[PDB]
Amino acid sequence: LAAVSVDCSEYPKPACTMEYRPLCGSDNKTYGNKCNFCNAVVESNGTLTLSHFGKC
């Protein structure tokens, strides 16, 4: 069960911009921004969850 989440409703997306607004995944990766994160949630078939906001 997810404690926290982001809005990944409109994903997948072909590109992201490069702003550095970090998110820490449950896989212990820091994702540079929400769009990289929500791209990875989709790619992982929803196995990826958000651990917390900010860099791991």
Specify the experimental method. X-ray
Cα 20 from Cα 42, distance rounded (Å): 20
Cα 10 off chain centre by: 13
Query: Parallel, antiparallel, or unpaired for β 50-53 and 30-31?
Result: unpaired
Are 34 and 21 in contact by the 8 Å Cβ rule? The answer is: yes
- Domain ranges across the chain: 1-56
Q: What are phi and psi of 16, to 5 degrees?
A: -130, 155
Cα 51 from Cα 33, distance rounded (Å): 14
C-alpha separations of 23 from 7, 36, 51 in Å: 13, 9, 8
Half-sphere exposure of 13 (CA within 13 A, CB side): 12
Fold held by 1-56: Wheat Germ Agglutinin (Isolectin 2); domain 1 (3.30.60)
- Experimental structure resolution, Å: 1.5
